[PDB]
């Protein structure tokens, strides 16, 4: 439990910690979408 919090905090600072998190942090409520978007990504 503790080690994930430490890895998450180092990720927030910016160290590229490769430790895989067992559960997601934030819910990430769906943002506000427009149809006239160019479709993303470079494929």
């Amino acid at each position: 439990h503790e080690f994930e919090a430490l890895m998450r905090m180092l990720d927030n600072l910016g160290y590229r910690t490769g430790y895989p998190y067992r559960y997601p942090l934030v819910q990430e409520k769906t943002k506000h979408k427009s149809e006239v978007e160019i479709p993303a990504t470079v494929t």
């Binding site: 506000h32 427009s34 149809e35 006239v36």
Partner: protein, 54 residues
């Protein structure tokens, strides 16, 4: 064949002409204005940004 509409066309560089053709086909400005939700959303953005200004 003496009007200036002919004149600029042969004074166009070719790539600028072709970019005009492509973005003519593409019609970005018309789509942004025709979409209701994003249009009134950006209206709200600029309106209350102005309201925050003065």
């Amino acid at each position: 064949e003496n009007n200036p509409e002919y004149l600029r066309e042969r004074n166009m560089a070719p790539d600028l002409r072709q970019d005009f053709n492509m973005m003519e086909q593409k019609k970005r400005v018309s789509m942004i204005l025709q979409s209701p939700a994003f249009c009134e959303e950006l209206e709200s953005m600029i309106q209350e940004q102005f309201k925050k200004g003065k």
